[PDB]
Amino acid sequence: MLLPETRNLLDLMDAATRGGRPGLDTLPHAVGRKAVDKMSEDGEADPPEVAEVANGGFAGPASEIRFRRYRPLGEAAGLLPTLIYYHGGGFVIGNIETHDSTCRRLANKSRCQVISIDYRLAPEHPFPAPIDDGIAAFRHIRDNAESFGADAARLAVGGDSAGGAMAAVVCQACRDAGETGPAFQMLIYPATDSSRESASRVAFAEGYFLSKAHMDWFWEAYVPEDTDLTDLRLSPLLATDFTGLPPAFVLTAGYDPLRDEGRAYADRLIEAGIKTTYVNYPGTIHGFFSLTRFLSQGLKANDEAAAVMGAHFGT
Amino acid sequence: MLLPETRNLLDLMDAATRGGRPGLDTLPHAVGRKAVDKMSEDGEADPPEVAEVANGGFAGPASEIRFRRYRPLGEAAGLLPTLIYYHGGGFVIGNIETHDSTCRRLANKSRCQVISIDYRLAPEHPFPAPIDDGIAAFRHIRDNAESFGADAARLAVGGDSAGGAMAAVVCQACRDAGETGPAFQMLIYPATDSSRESASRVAFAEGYFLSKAHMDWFWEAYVPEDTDLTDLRLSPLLATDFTGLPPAFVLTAGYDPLRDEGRAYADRLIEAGIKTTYVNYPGTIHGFFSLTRFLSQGLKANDEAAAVMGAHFGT
Numbered sequence: 001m002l003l004p005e006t007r008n009l010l011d012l013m014d015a016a017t018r019g020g021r022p023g024l025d026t027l028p029h030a031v032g033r034k035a036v037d038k039m040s041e042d043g044e045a046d047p048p049e050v051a052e053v054a055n056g057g058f059a060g061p062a063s064e065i066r067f068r069r070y071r072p073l074g075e076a077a078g079l080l081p082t083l084i085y086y087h088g089g090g091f092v093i094g095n096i097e098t099h100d101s102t103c104r105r106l107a108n109k110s111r112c113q114v115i116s117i118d119y120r121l122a123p124e125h126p127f128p129a130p131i132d133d134g135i136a137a138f139r140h141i142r143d144n145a146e147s148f149g150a151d152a153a154r155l156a157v158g159g160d161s162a163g164g165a166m167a168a169v170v171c172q173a174c175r176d177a178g179e180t181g182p183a184f185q186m187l188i189y190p191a192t193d194s195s196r197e198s199a200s201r202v203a204f205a206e207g208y209f210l211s212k213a214h215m216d217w218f219w220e221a222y223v224p225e226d227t228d229l230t231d232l233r234l235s236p237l238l239a240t241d242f243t244g245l246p247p248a249f250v251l252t253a254g255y256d257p258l259r260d261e262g263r264a265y266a267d268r269l270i271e272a273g274i275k276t277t278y279v280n281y282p283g284t285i286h287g288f289f290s291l292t293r294f295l296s297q298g299l300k301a302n303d304e305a306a307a308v309m310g311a312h313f314g315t
Numbered sequence: 316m317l318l319p320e321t322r323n324l325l326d327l328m329d330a331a332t333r334g335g336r337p338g339l340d341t342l343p344h345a346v347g348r349k350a351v352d353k354m355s356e357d358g359e360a361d362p363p364e365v366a367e368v369a370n371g372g373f374a375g376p377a378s379e380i381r382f383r384r385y386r387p388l389g390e391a392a393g394l395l396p397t398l399i400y401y402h403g404g405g406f407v408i409g410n411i412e413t414h415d416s417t418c419r420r421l422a423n424k425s426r427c428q429v430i431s432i433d434y435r436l437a438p439e440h441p442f443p444a445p446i447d448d449g450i451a452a453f454r455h456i457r458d459n460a461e462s463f464g465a466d467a468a469r470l471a472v473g474g475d476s477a478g479g480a481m482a483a484v485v486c487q488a489c490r491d492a493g494e495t496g497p498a499f500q501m502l503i504y505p506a507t508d509s510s511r512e513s514a515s516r517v518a519f520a521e522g523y524f525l526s527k528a529h530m531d532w533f534w535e536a537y538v539p540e541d542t543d544l545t546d547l548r549l550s551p552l553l554a555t556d557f558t559g560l561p562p563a564f565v566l567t568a569g570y571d572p573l574r575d576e577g578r579a580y581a582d583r584l585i586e587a588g589i590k591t592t593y594v595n596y597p598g599t600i601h602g603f604f605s606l607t608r609f610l611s612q613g614l615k616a617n618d619e620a621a622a623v624m625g626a627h628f629g630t
């Protein structure tokens with residue numbers, strides 16, 4: 001069931017692996033970061049023009065949080081409906097640049113403003129630093145909506161991987177603290193369960209991009225030893241109550257370890273009486289949502305996600 | 316439990332029931348048709364302008380099949396990706412007019428051409444006349460693609476209720492006959508199982524729009540007595556094999572008898588390794604997709620469906 005374009009890219013990665021490039025799972029996460037980050041940038045399709053890009057920062061819990069805003073083409077209104085995007089990369093790698101092309105394409109298609117967040121990475125800052133910045137960024141942008149040129153009424157969050165995880169947590173956190181949370185959550189191949197191993201986590205543990213070897217490498221950096229795995233910030237799937245959470249878009253990939261716990265989360269939402277959209281892209285891998293130089297499916301997904309959020313806010 | 320807008324409409328329908336002297340369940344099929352068809356037209360929100368509308372017909376199995384084409388605004392290309400729409404109404408009521416506003420709105424949003432089909436109705440022509448016209452219409456438009464100003468590469472089908480049923484069958488029929496079937500199937504709260512009663516068919520049998528009394532009234536007209544209920548043209552959910560069917564959009568409503576068998580069909584598709592999008596609109600009723608004069612959610616759904624198909628064909 002693997003697609004030609006997907007299989008093609010897997011050949012390339014197999015060539016490089018067995019020909020000089022070590023993979024190595026180099027623990028100088030600080031060293032490895034710089035190498036992989038450059039690869040990620042190249043993996044993204046060439047960036048589409050937008051109306052306006054803006055770089056800025058603000059005060060976080062423990063630091064300055066950097067951010068970048070993309071205003072979509074031919075969108076004249078001051079306050080726009082706005083998505084707050086958290087990049088992927090195991091709370092260890094990635095940055096605004098690795099997901100720039102994707103955010104540009106999302107804003108154009110959705111006819112919505114996008115605000116990429118640059119949150120504290122591990123190991124330099126471990127659990128729970130990353131999601132604390134994720135939550136602070138939402139609260140800040142919510143409370144200073146007009147400053148960020150954003151309609152407070154139609155304010156959403158989303159991400160991929162660790163990013164998608166981080167998004168789902170921000171929504172729970174808000175409901176738990178009984179304050180106004182997001183209007184919409186866009187969850188792309190997110191990780192929702194640290195407490196156990198699904199079928200897919202075992203079935204695709206090796207050979208399909210994201211490897212079990214990679215997930216350990218990330219885990220050892222992000223998580224201090226002896227941290228309760230049934231913490232909802234690590235495992236939001238284990239929440240008792242799913243009611244009062246915002247409408248969701250949830251996307252999974254066919255050859256993804258994080259497939260089964262992805263659809264699981266989506267199901268918990270549907271039965272809780274929440275407006276939900278689930279989608280499976282069979283025959284592509286984890287990370288296709290931003291490897292848009294190699295996988296067209298990624299661009300189709302970029303378009304589909306953008307479209308469902310757009311239709312929700314009626315843009 | 317329900318939405319305000321949904322609850323609001325339900326009581327009005329309840330006003331007439333005892334308030335005046337109504338009752339479709341108790342009318343001659345041919346008489347009732349004329350009355351309800353006019354109500355349906357009024358139930359639709361005011362029609363959006365399009366680039367071009369075109370009426371025509373062609374030779375079917377047993378008769379002339381009428382049709383109407385909607386070309387979307389600011390779409391200059393000759394051959395467009397095209398959806399073939401089958402109206403709802405228990406294979407007994409409805410026509411192109413009852414679903415005109417909705418088709419117009421779909422074409423604009425999706426940036427795709429829409430072709431509403433006017434298929435033979437019961438009791439005048441019972442099972443299996445309606446779906447036979449449904450299949451002939453697709454085959455014809457497929458084989459004369461450029462005549463109908465349509466990209467053959469990106470040709471889809473869809474509908475609501477009996478229409479959604481009719482769409483799902485066209486795709487199966489094509490795969491069974493080992494010929495080129497549609498590229499995409501848009502299934503809106505469709506009926507997929509005649510062979511038994513789900514939980515929702517019982518739980519919402521009375522008081523929420525579609526009534527069990529209505530479904531019987533339709534059934535007695537459409538279906539010759541002593542017809543095997545496990546026929547796949549009546550019950551496409553009971554198909555052995557789901558592989559080789561086109562990518563799907565599937566939508567259900569919270570207070571719909573046809574809810575459980577809707578999601579069931581969607582699930583059969585996901586496990587068959589087909590690219591699928593499922594969505595539930597909780598706290599609205601069956602038929603909201605075209606009662607867009609009363610229910611905003613309907614317009615949001617109209618937009619969402621259009622958007623997912625658009626993103627698929629990359630318009």
Ligand SMILES: *[P@](=O)(CCCCCC)OCCCC
Pocket residue numbers: 010013014205206207208209210211212213
């Ligand atoms: P991942 O699946 C590596 C699996 C080896 C784990 C060590 C036992 O990388 C896939 C690379 C493309 C072929």
Ligand SMILES: *[P@](=O)(CCCCCC)OCCCC
Pocket residue numbers: 325328329332520521522523524525526527
């Ligand atoms: P059916 O579900 C039952 C007729 C009214 C009984 C109220 C419990 O048709 C419903 C139409 C909306 C009142």
